[PDB]
Amino acid sequence: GKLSEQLKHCNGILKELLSKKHAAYAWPFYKPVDASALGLHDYHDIIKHPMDLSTVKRKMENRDYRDAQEFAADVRLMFSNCYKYNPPDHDVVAMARKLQDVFEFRYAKMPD
Numbered sequence: 001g002k003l004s005e006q007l008k009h010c011n012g013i014l015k016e017l018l019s020k021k022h023a024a025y026a027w028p029f030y031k032p033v034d035a036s037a038l039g040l041h042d043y044h045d046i047i048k049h050p051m052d053l054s055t056v057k058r059k060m061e062n063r064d065y066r067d068a069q070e071f072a073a074d075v076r077l078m079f080s081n082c083y084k085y086n087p088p089d090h091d092v093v094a095m096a097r098k099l100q101d102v103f104e105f106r107y108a109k110m111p112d
């Protein structure tokens with residue numbers, strides 16, 4: 001988990017993004033995109049830096065993130081990858097937009 005006050009807020013957000021409350025739209029972001037399994041044979045040609053919430057959780061648990069900004073960059077990279085790869089009318093993009101709304105509104109409540 002987070003040690004710094006701001007990293008504890010980040011860890012709180014991460015726990016919320018992984019909670020049953022948001023599972024209906026969070027689930028595509030729980031684990032790395034399995035490009036082979038999903039038939040997305042161009043995924044790793046288009047997405048140079050895959051990211052997902054299990055990777056963010058591992059990095060938080062390993063004290064990889066030194067500040068809130070570094071944590072937020074990985075969460076936003078995950079959404080950006082979704083918006084880059086997927087047609088904007090795909091269900092996964094609607095789910096990304098909803099989960100990013102949850103993220104951005106709570107990230108904005110960061111303690112100073």
Ligand SMILES: CNC(=O)c1cc(C(=O)NC2CC2)cn(Cc2ccccc2)c1=O
Pocket residue numbers: 028029033038040082085086087090091092095
């Ligand atoms: C981060 N996830 C992805 O980018 C992703 C891409 C595609 C996908 O098939 N994308 C192609 C480009 C349309 C499929 N799923 C599963 C899914 C998700 C939501 C509804 C149905 C299926 C994903 O999670």
